[PDB]
Amino acid sequence: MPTDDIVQLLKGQEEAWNRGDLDAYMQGYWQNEQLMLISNGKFRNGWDETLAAYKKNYPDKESLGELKFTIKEIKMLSNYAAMVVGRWDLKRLKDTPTGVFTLLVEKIDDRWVITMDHSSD
Amino acid sequence: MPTDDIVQLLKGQEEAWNRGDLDAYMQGYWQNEQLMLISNGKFRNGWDETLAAYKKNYPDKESLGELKFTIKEIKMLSNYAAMVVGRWDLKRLKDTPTGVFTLLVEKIDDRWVITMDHSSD
Ligand SMILES: [Cl-]
Ligand SMILES: [Cl-]
């Protein structure tokens, strides 16, 4: 079932993040210059650029912190596209940042990948 | 063409907002308890609840300010669903708030309506 595959995609990302593997984490995202990440106030695009940004921001794997997603809803839009709405939580040394996310996931090459990710706090 | 209808939906909302007509503005959104609006950090649902919230926040039509959307991308996902990514701008008496939005629009009853709206700044 697609919802199960979509759930596993996000579970895999939590697990990769939580073992400090940015390369594995990035496998949840569409590997394309069109990949669109939206933050609180800005747009950025591209998978290479996004991977580079995480490496820049987290030179030490211990700095990633512990990630958990709480999925509020998965809505199938077609056999090839779904929207995923949830909260994210990070447990850090001196804080516990929280926020929300909304994702478009699409079936590309028989795999579900995140093609647009709007995360805010 | 659906992209033209989606563009017009957002143009109609600008126009309604800019003449102080919240009821007309709300016609851009799916009229359902499932309507999902995501802000920087929180979820809210429902069309009635959203209309009530705008009326609460903007008791005076002059307080709405001038709204403009700048659409960055419309992506058709199927004949029934599209994602819309853009910036919003408001011109107010003493400031000019800006931010980003990502929307799911869906063809429901042969009309394009916003069913999920994640707006942040
Ligand atoms: Cl389909
Ligand atoms: Cl279709």
Cα–Cα distance, B3 to B76 (Å, whole number): 8
Residue A53's nearest CA partner among A37, A30, A67 is A37
Class of domain B2-121: alpha beta
Nearest by CB to B100, from A38, A83, A85: name it.
A38
Cα–Cα distance, B121 to B115 (Å, whole number): 20
Which of chain B's residues have a Cβ under 8 Å away from the Cβ of A41? 98-100, 120-121
Q: What technique determined this structure?
A: X-ray
- Listed in sequence order, the residues at least 6 apart from B22 whose beta carbon sits closer than 8 Å to its beta carbon are B16, B51, B54, B55, B58
Pairing of strands B36-38, A43-45: unpaired
Resolution limit in angstroms?
Answer: 1.7
For chain B, domain boundaries:
2-121
Cα–Cα distance, B81 to A101 (Å, whole number): 19
Cα-based torsion angle of the residue sequence A92, A95, A99, A103 in order, rounded to the nearest 10 degrees = -10
Q: How far, rounded to the nearest angstrom, does the alpha carbon of residue A22 sit from its chain's CA centroid?
A: 11
Pairing of strands A98-108, A111-120: antiparallel
Tell me the shortest Cα–Cα distance from B65 to chain A, in angstroms: 20
**Cα–Cα separations (whole angstroms), residue A114 to A32, B12, B84:** 11, 31, 16
